[model samples]
Target chain A: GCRHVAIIMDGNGRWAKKQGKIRAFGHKAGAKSVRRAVSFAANNGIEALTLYAFSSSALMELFVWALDSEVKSLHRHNVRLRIIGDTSRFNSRLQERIRKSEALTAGNTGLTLNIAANYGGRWDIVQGVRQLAEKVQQGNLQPDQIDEEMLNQHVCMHELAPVDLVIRTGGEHRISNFLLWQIAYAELYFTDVLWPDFDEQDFEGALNAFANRERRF
Target chain B: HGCRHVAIIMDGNGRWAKKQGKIRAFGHKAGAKSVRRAVSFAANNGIEALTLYAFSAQEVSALMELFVWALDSEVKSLHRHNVRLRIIGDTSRFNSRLQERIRKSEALTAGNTGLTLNIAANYGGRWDIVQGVRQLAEKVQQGNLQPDQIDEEMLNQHVCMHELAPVDLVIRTGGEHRISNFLLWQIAYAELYFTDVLWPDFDEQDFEGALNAFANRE
Candidate 1:
């Protein structure tokens, strides 16, 4: 009876483009919508929720600078936030913010908020393997003892568990590298509602749609 | 309708081994038989293409004896069936014997048209993409290809793997839901079927069940 929904919040730029504003404005407004969905889920009894905030392999450097303020505000909400990705590629300022925000929300039990920043599905797998390889090299974890569960634990979204359903808003009908390993069996729901304007009604619509679907796994 | 190309993820060798009161080697041997059976089944059914997950990229070093035996079986099967064999793997690190077996299989099946059995050994979806990109990048650099026209089709063409037929049905045995690095690009829109039947015991019933499931969905 538990439903874990993950969303790839796309079309923020398109939303801004349609309104005759820059993408930065769209993302800022979209971040606010993300916050609303978080609050809505907490109140609605949804177990786990993940948002594809950023991918390590594919992202705009300019947006990081443009939406810094809005991102900071989102971080200050004290929900459990994990920037699931290869952080070494990020600049020092962003890295520091990541560490700070994680420390700030480390104790929160309200909702497990996963912000997938600078994360690629393949990159996550490679990085997880590299981490295990390092341990093996240092004689900590034996290479022979490695298994699927061990590798799963080291993946970017290890703490969040597997997703039950993935929602792609803003008219995109693809997975787009969002929770690739976790959503192996998740029901996919697509919507044209842009993230900036995606409200409780839109969120509930996706949840309701998911509730009607059957999961054979 | 008959499947021209039937691809599968032959999973659960280790688990299948445990269930049989045998080591992973016994499981691999048993699974190898299933692989042969599946290939012959496809060939007999007039299926021109068959791709099986022989040795995953990460699982290559898990058990050397078991891995070597599987490769040996692959070589023997390709020769016996006279099937065109190709190992869709990152084969740069494999030993000479392994590489020779792969080469020999392809050479033996060069003139044959019974069935094209692609063995995905040490392969990953992203790696295949990167290889395709690198090849196309060279073509672009040499004025052989226009950089402006490098669409998905162009990328698909660069893949040495033949024919871009969108995977109709992807069967992942052993109850694993994940794709696990198999056919990343081609399976973009595949109707995925996951089962707990374990590779060793998978038979006509399993294949029919997958097809029936697809039929029901459609």
Candidate 2:
């Protein structure tokens, strides 16, 4: 019954290296697991799903095309596509593709899928503040009205449910600056399974672990 | 070098009580003892700053009484050592008498040069940041600063415990993996350690384990 779940899909490079292949091979393999995860979340009635497909620098075109294609199939399964981050830094073609995909599934009611590409937690906060500052400068909003909730409103994914469970694959315990504000009260679940190897069973295990936790928040 | 500062969320008192077939207050009483143990260990180990989340679960009167007792005991012993005791969060919400005692206790050990033991009484990390934002906004409104000039550093200066070093490691007891809104901005890059041990059962060895994990972390 988790409303929102965030995943740090880590260890793609390591998984590829272990298989004696290039990093691109691991990312390709990881994309398959993403489809499996989306199906699982939609089937289980999970409302919002966030994935950390970090490092949007190297395989920019490939990732854009890959995710663009994935979005078409995902929308068919009732998953809304939302790309959160500084997309202005991305090439205009990729940005247009992202905007189109997001618009295509904007009305989706089943599950909200968030893919953090070219994202940083600090950058999110900073950008949120920057927006408020501009509003203040425009004389439309007062600086004194700036509070936690006000700042939250400007951050990416503010309209969605706050992250309830944050699962980091690849056995990494650190968040590596992912969704810093949103995951402030999220139950962190770290697993040794790499992104490409993560299956529905592992996802269920994380869900079970989250269910057992006595969330004081 | 040893760890300079560490923050902890002392969780699972109610569950510890349930396991023992006792009242939650009993578990809280036991957890109090663990706080004493932790303070002593930190001071002995030369940890400069130790921030503990003390009031996660419990009623006001019972927790307040225990806090007064702890403060008295701490002040008496901490005077001998150089450990300074400071409580984060807003104490103005407390009764006047309790507030006075807090002020007196803080003044008593204000000059201590050893471990700075910061107990978060009625604190939430969001509250800390909001307060900071309010302060900054007021300055902006007063023409002392510009809104566009505001940044992380400006907010950091206004948050609680700005003088202390950033938290290096954050440990949560009772197997809960959430930060629960404790030290949000302060622990931006901290190494998080979660353990299944309840707050009452947490000991010095568990503390050492967290430190060791931090040491070995890449």
Candidate 3:
């Protein structure tokens, strides 16, 4: 239905009942469901898939842990993978894993999977513009030369297709400051099913919805 | 309980009018009337700001003409109710006639303080962000600011409605579920309200239904 699909995979911690523990088992389960989502996207002809994995949800370590296993599966499936947010805040161990993870999946020809870590849409734009401002101050770029394309060259995932469908689950009707610049004209889809429970059918329904709609632009 | 600003895509007017056997001009006029109703409700309901996405769709001349008449008819009542009318669009390209009318209208409502009404014509959300970023570049290149000083807060200061709160609710008629480039950077945290109700038939009840939907989110 759409060439590029971005999803806000929410409710990773929806069933957690304890706070003193490491939150490992639940996240282990969490990672499995996400694998199904990625597999579905790859098999369904969706060229690029962007999924939100906010740092606050305790998924960072799982991501690092998955670098060796889940990412291994993606690498085998010819799926290229990368993270869309800042990695500076991540510890050296996880950061190193990301570098190797991305490098390993860099040449895959199947679905391009982007997982957002410490990402906010405004933060993405600010960082992008910050680079341009750096150029203007250094005489490399002129003030008048600044524009959307130049700024676009700086935001996350600019090398890939712009998001055509942004699906947010967990029943939220808000963008939550996600992909503000990229989603300028993108169709939005919302559903009540949280991320952990969002299966192939939910993803298909979202695709079904986008296929039936008309884009005036 | 937390909505401070509402932005709308006033759509489906032409289709609605066509169903009644009328030209697009008639639909545009009816859409203008619906705008007045929305403005009245926003002003009375203490909505800090209301931005209406109006003015365009193939027939530029008729749309601009309709815009001029809408401004001419509403400025008095808008000013009378202390509604501060502000037009936020790329005005440099507006037809000369409509541009002149806009200048006169802004001068008339320059001092009203109650509700801030933003009429968006020929506006693109990305254009708003680019203009703001260019301003940042201007400031940096002029030696008044450093590249490192640029952040979300600073960029926010340069966009339209920089002085007001971010939009809280973004409503669209004609059952659309996309932003269509209307205030993108501004509506990052907005609750979207989508309804099949066309602009021509969007009464106060329809608007209140949107508000009710927004309030329910709280």
Which pairs of residues collide in candidate 1? A55-A118, A55-A119, A56-A118, A56-A119
The order by descending lDDT is: 3, 2, 1
Write model 2 residue lDDT over A131-181, tens digit each, in one string. 766665566777557777888898789998888899989875777778887
Q: Against the true two-chain complex, what DockQ does each candidate achieve?
A: 0.06, 0.47, 0.76
Q: How big an interface RMSD has model 3? A: 1.3
lDDT of 1 by residue, A105-172 (tens): 67776567777766666556555555655555455654336655676777676766568777777764
Estimate how well candidate 3 is docked, as a DockQ score.
0.76
- Candidate 1 lDDT over B46-160, as tens digits, reads 6677778753335545444355556665566566776777777677677677677667767877667678777775676656655655555455445555444555555566554
Give, for candidate 2 chain B, the lowest lDDT window spanning 10 residues. B54-63
Model 2 agreement with the true structure over B1-218: per-residue lDDT tens digits: 35788899998888999988999889989998898798788888888899999535357756766676667766767767787878888676677877778878788888898899888877877777767766765665566676668776767788888898877888989876788888787777778898989999999998889888887874
Instruction: Please list all clashing residue pairs in model 2, or write none if there are none.
Output: none
Q: Top model by TM-score, which number?
A: 3
lDDT per residue as tens, model 3, B1-218? 56789998989988888899999989978987888888889888889999989623568746656766767877888888888878887786767877778878778787777888888876778888998998898888899998888888889888988888789999989877888888878887889888889898998899888888899887
Candidates' C-alpha lDDT = 0.67, 0.81, 0.82
Candidate 3 falls in which docking quality class?
medium
Model 1 score (lDDT): 0.67
Per-candidate Cα RMSD to the true structure, in Å, reads 10.6, 3.2, 2.9
Fnat across every predicted model, in order: 0.03, 0.48, 0.85
Highest-scoring model, DockQ: 3
